Amino acid sequence: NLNDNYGISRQQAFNLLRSDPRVLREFINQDNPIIRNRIEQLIMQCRL
Amino acid sequence: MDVLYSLSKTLKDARDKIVEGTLYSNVSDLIQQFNQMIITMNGNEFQTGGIGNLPIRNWNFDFGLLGTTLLNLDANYVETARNTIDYFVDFVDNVCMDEMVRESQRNGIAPQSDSLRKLSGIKFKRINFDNSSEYIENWNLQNRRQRTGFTFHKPNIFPYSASFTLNRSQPAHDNLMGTMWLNAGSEIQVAGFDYSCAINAPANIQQFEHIVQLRRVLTTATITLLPDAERFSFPRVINSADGATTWYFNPVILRPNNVEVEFLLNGQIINTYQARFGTIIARNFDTIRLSFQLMRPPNMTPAVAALFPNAQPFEHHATVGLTLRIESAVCESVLADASKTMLANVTSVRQEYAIPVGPVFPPGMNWTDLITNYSPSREDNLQRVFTVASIRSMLVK
Amino acid sequence: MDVLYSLSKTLKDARDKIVEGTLYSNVSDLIQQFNQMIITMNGNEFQTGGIGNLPIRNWNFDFGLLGTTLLNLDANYVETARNTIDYFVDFVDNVCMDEMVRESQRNGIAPQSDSLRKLSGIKFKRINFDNSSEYIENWNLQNRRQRTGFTFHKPNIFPYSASFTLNRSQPAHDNLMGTMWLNAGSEIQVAGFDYSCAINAPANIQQFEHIVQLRRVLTTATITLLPDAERFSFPRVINSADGATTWYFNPVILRPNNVEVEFLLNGQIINTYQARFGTIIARNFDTIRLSFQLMRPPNMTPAVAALFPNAQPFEHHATVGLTLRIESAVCESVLADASKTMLANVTSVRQEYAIPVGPVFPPGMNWTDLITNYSPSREDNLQRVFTVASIRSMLVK
Amino acid sequence: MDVLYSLSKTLKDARDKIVEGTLYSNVSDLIQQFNQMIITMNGNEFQTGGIGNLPIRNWNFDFGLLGTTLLNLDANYVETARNTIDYFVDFVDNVCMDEMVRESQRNGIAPQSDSLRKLSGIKFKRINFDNSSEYIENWNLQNRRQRTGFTFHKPNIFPYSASFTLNRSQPAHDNLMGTMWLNAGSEIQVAGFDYSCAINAPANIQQFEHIVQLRRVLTTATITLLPDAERFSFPRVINSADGATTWYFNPVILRPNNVEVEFLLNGQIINTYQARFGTIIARNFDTIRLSFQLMRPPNMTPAVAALFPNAQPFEHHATVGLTLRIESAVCESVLADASKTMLANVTSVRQEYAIPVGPVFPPGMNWTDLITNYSPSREDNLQRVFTVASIRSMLVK
Amino acid sequence: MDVLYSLSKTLKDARDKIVEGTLYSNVSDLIQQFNQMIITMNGNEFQTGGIGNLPIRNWNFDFGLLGTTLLNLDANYVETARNTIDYFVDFVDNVCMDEMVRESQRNGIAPQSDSLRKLSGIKFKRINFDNSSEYIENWNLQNRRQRTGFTFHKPNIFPYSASFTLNRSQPAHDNLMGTMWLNAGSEIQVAGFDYSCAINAPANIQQFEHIVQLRRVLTTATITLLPDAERFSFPRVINSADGATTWYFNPVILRPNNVEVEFLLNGQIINTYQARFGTIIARNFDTIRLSFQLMRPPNMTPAVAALFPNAQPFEHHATVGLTLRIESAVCESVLADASKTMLANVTSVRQEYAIPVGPVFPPGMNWTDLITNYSPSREDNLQRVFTVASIRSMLVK
């Protein structure tokens, strides 16, 4: 979904694959809803 | 078949363009075409029918050509043109009515109604004028095998399936969990229901999933996805699996959370959409996996706590719905829609001429049992009859 | 009218084909037709309007022919072409409005808007180029009377009617039985209700019949029939027949058993479908008869036995519903649809120019009161205004 | 763009018309056009791509002309013609897929995908054959600015908004008054709900108003306005504004009385409808004002009197609803529909080739956020990509 | 395909006839045909491979013809002939190995392996020498649609199905009545077992029936029918229906009385055989019905009366068997046998070059799951791969 809508560069793709906090937080500050939804779902799964 | 569409198109264009007062300068080409058609035809004797109440007809063409020296068209010309066109028109109508009823498992693409095989012979090939129509164009493409396409508005690809699935059930049917779905025409209305509002489930969350599998791939589908499924949102009395007993269903709608719709193809995933509602797209898909959840509200008022208690009675069953309609799409395979009449023409002809059931199509050509097994043989025969139905409809609507 | 269609078509094809750089070999014939149109028009003065806000515009045509020594085109030719075509375009738009805003019960097919009576003269007959479109084809067919037809997608053949019929009534409205129905546009939704849940009936079975009659015949109709109607499935407060008091309707949907859909024609049965759902067909029908049943469940759980008792309170009323949408169709007469704009353009013109109400159309052309009494005069006028409105739309959308 | 549409149209017409056995007298013009196109193209080298996962291709046109010597086309000629046409078709598909992806805030109308800038040159302007399609006609018109318009069936102009509004609220949520609405695509389903049933109100009447403000003006809209909104007619558990708590909603439908629909424009009123249902028309409107009421039935049966008492519990909340669906319409600007696959093609291409997000279109081209902010630059770019998508889809489906 | 068969046949006849010392009087026609082939081929360039582990080999043909100037062939001629024939043979083998692996649902009869789509052109049709073989003859017949036929020796038409049916069951499995059958390849072995020896049955007789419905119709079948089915004639431990427990089975064989074997066709009876065993015939049948009985011997000796008591233990269960093999047959469609290596060659090619599993053939082409659904698509693909396998076997076995 991300690569489709928010077309992604090679470095960003490699770092998302490696699960890099730098690019993760760059997206979270870019206000990417496709990622904010995933994070809110992680919250709703880490509630209890 | 190309010469049949040529006949139909040049006859329509004759009936339209050739009218008193017009100018020969604009219809000389069509007139040379009509006269070449007359020359190709004259001398050939055809037969038509011999199945069902289709009367057996015999055609013998001996006509005279049309003048070409005039400047403005007069009545003494148009009248002869019409006396000549009506014959070919009823001939083509009878041919299409004879060709829409015949079936075969081997080489359905091959023409039945052997008069049409004769027309498909090599001496009639000189009649082809323009293969402009969508159907005949895709037909020529499939002959010269290439990437095809039919564009559809609200296509009828889902057969009528109104059924449920229970993942926790008892003989008493007082604490159930599961999912209902009605898939019909171009719409799917699905609804996950739990009687206990996820009071015992982990994390106060209950999951629901619905995997629909289409019998043919689609492309560029414009889809409208909305929450709060309608026809699973009122009190109901629903039968059991084995049809023995009945149980009650008093639903109460909540909001879908963590909704995700995945458009897959051959089990691999193509497109996905998470918490996006309204107008979405699917570029290539053969399968639709919906996955949603039911989350007990942590905060609750007196009135709703009166409906979601912590004990077994549970006289209000929490539900979460999803409606999904396919407004438009494109498909390599021929289907039915809410725009085109070809299926209606075929079924009307069969009903009118009392055609017994064949080996391929089910009785009455019920789209449900005709799309529940969309074998390539059925696809070929259906494309054939739809093409000749389009052809007929171009002349006699 | 044929000449008007010819004008609109050659003007469209002029605005389209005559562009910068294109080749004269492609437009020589259209240019001959345009020059002939010019030759035939030049020397005539026309008047348009004089009813409502329409100004009384006088048109004079003094134009020069199109050169023919050129091989390709330049902007210095397209400019003159446009400065000449815009005038004919607005003249055609004004004539089309002047013909949309006039009516007649005597010879409604005959041309009103006397400028058009002039254009129908025998000197203008040299302008007919091609009568290709559906509306003009059917116009010329009906003139030369033949089996015509208009193809529609979701036509508005049902007037808005929301009503009920009670076969067992009481002043307290406590134990009722009957059927409610909403018939609107291209859909019907009909629901048979019983407050007693078929306890006192014979064999625990109650019957329900809905007989719909169409004010115009149809053919090759494609229909979608589904159970469990959606707008007769939730709590309701309905009014009495005499409209004094109100009563309450708490439904519970069950399945239609022994469902039977009979599409008839002057009482002659044509199509009959028994327990078939989804997509279906009707080759020819004027009347529909939907006959279904409410069968008490013999095997009932406690939760539902507590809702269908054997006593008078009856706080949950058994219901059985059917939706029936007509997706496509073919009709010998003209109607309205969800795809085309003829009715919209007509009503928009009339509302914009404040035309008084005539002896034929109702006030504001409310389609319900227009399709209720579909007199042949109204049919002729509606065909005429739809044809000229389609013509106008071919130039100004 | 005109030359792109001309390429696509003459390639379509070459794949259709040019078939073995046809008559050169019918395709001489198209053959001259094709040969002239080949001449104009011979000697140029084009480059295509360079963005996202689109490959970088180089095209070099050096073909041979098509013989004008024959009278009846044979297979040795058709085969060469198709070998020549498939290269052009691949080139046009690749150009369209290069052009649908790029954006610009400065002169979005001015072409991108610089091969297309090159094709916009003055040595290529000799290729234009005819511009008849709706999108290309409106393109040329809006360039030569005039009163244009696109026709739409069931247009998607409302962004998905499912929301409520409470004019009397409490923390317990036991006596509420307010209105709910779902505005999505072509439908608006609104429902005014009062828990007190207008007992403490003056004259036993409570009003509700809904104002919808479109971003682009429409015209000649055909609308279906029905009562008893469906998706606001079953039990619900809805969350507060601030999400703190939830509340129960058990609705009971009543008719809306003294209803009024005002279609406005720049605050001025244009159309007004009183107590009319079924099909209606709106000739021009930028704003819709629905106004309906809830009137307590003065007379009441025992059941409904015991369901609408004069005390605060109020376990059955009175509602009054209205569904409004735009079926057809006409608009000076370009939108999405349920008939055309242009938006679908564009979005599918972007999703396939992983196009980075640009300055104009929103990420992923989500129609909700694309119609909630329809600024002129977005409008122009959307028109451009829709037009080239229509072009690409006239050839490859 | 015809050109491929012609290639293979002339290369076979070249490797055979063209040898040192032979006489030009015998091979003049073959030399003319080979020279015509070399001429038709010289100038073409083919590519073969690219699926799985098949290498992508490009073939370029530029050879010199074979003189016709001598009487007796010398080694200097045969050497050149062989150095050309080995290349042509390897090329044809690679073409066949690329054609045996490509599948399609739509037009499986049409050449895949596009090098062969090229060979199927009209400049290559000059190669056809004689289509004599059974497979190619039936191919030409199915193209010129007519009544075909393939002769088979021991045709594998039955899928492996070992299964029983208990018309009287108990939880302990101590008094059973039923029938077991194994249907495999060309043979059926059926056995009707009763644990009570028909003691409680009327007239001391028990009936047993077995109906096999074939997936394809056979004709002129020769059959060997015998009693005392062997593989169900010794002790056994057989599982239950649901597979939970097991039960013992101690068969004691008797003879079938009132034996009746009916070869039916569409429910009608065609051949009937009563009390006959050994060689029989069946001229046409799609279904076989074997109906036998078990008759208690009235006059029993001590040793046997001590086995079939009048009480519940029943430690010896009476059985009656029937074997039926289909030795030879004729079928309008294609199957597999114990005589022809086409299927083996196909599956070996696929296993060797690691061909993935496609939409049509099951994984590994297991004949059980391939005959259990004999779709027309599967029939066409199977005939195509079998024909080209026969072709490749005519050169390399």
Side-chain angles (χ1 to χ4, degrees), chain C residues 115-133:
Chain C
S115 60
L116 179 57
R117 298 174 183 270
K118 190 176 184 298
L119 292 169
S120 75
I122 199 72
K123 63 181 74 173
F124 302 93
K125 191 61 62 173
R126 304 184 182 280
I127 298 157
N128 295 21
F129 185 67
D130 71 81
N131 304 121
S132 298
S133 170

Side-chain angles (χ1 to χ4, degrees), chain B residues 104-107 109-110 112 117 142-143 145 150 216 332-334 375-377 379-380 383, chain E residues 104-112 117 142-143 145 216 332-333 375-377 379-380 383:
Chain B
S104 174
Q105 296 181 7
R106 286 203 67 75
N107 312 327
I109 299 300
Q112 306 299 342
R117 298 173 174 270
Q142 291 169 33
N143 296 18
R145 284 181 60 80
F150 307 93
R216 282 290 182 278
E332 287 187 347
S333 300
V334 71
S375 180
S377 61
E379 182 175 355
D380 295 4
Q383 195 188 133
Chain E
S104 173
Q105 295 182 346
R106 303 222 69 168
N107 301 335
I109 294 286
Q112 308 302 338
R117 295 175 175 277
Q142 289 188 8
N143 297 16
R145 282 173 58 81
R216 276 280 161 280
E332 295 182 2
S333 304
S375 301
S377 61
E379 183 176 341
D380 296 0
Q383 191 188 328

Side-chain angles (χ1 to χ4, degrees), chain B residues 152-343:
Chain B
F152 298 148
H153 161 48
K154 193 182 289 300
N156 307 12
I157 194 171
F158 299 94
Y160 179 81
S161 300
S163 46
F164 62 96
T165 291
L166 300 166
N167 300 333
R168 185 176 70 269
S169 179
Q170 303 86 348
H173 299 272
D174 60 330
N175 178 23
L176 305 179
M177 194 275 287
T179 163
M180 307 178 74
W181 69 91
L182 184 134
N183 313 346
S186 175
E187 53 177 2
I188 293 162
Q189 298 194 53
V190 70
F193 66 101
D194 184 12
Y195 281 27
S196 63
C197 199
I199 193 80
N200 299 327
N204 306 22
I205 294 160
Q206 189 68 81
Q207 237 296 131
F208 303 92
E209 56 184 0
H210 185 20
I211 294 160
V212 183
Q213 187 68 50
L214 321 184
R215 318 308 186 189
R216 282 290 182 278
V217 186
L218 298 171
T219 41
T220 63
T222 310
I223 290 161
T224 306
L225 172 55
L226 305 173
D228 307 336
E230 289 78 346
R231 58 169 60 267
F232 299 105
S233 59
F234 37 77
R236 282 176 168 277
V237 172
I238 325 196
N239 87 124
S240 179
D242 66 331
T245 191
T246 62
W247 43 274
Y248 183 53
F249 181 68
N250 176 274
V252 174
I253 315 311
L254 290 79
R255 56 167 62 190
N257 61 318
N258 300 323
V259 69
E260 301 185 356
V261 174
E262 306 174 29
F263 306 96
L264 345 171
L265 173 63
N266 311 329
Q268 100 191 357
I269 195 177
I270 297 288
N271 272 90
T272 165
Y273 289 95
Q274 311 190 355
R276 190 180 294 187
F277 287 86
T279 299
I280 62 188
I281 311 294
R283 67 198 186 82
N284 198 304
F285 69 103
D286 197 274
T287 318
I288 295 161
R289 170 168 161 79
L290 305 95
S291 180
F292 58 94
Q293 298 183 2
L294 168 50
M295 163 50 97
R296 197 181 171 77
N299 298 318
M300 283 188 295
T301 29
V304 76
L307 305 165
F308 304 146
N310 300 334
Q312 206 102 329
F314 291 134
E315 299 185 359
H316 286 78
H317 315 141
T319 62
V320 173
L322 279 175
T323 302
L324 176 136
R325 303 190 300 278
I326 313 192
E327 288 183 357
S328 57
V330 179
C331 177
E332 287 187 347
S333 300
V334 71
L335 303 168
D337 312 319
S339 181
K340 67 205 186 69
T341 55
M342 292 47 170
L343 184 61

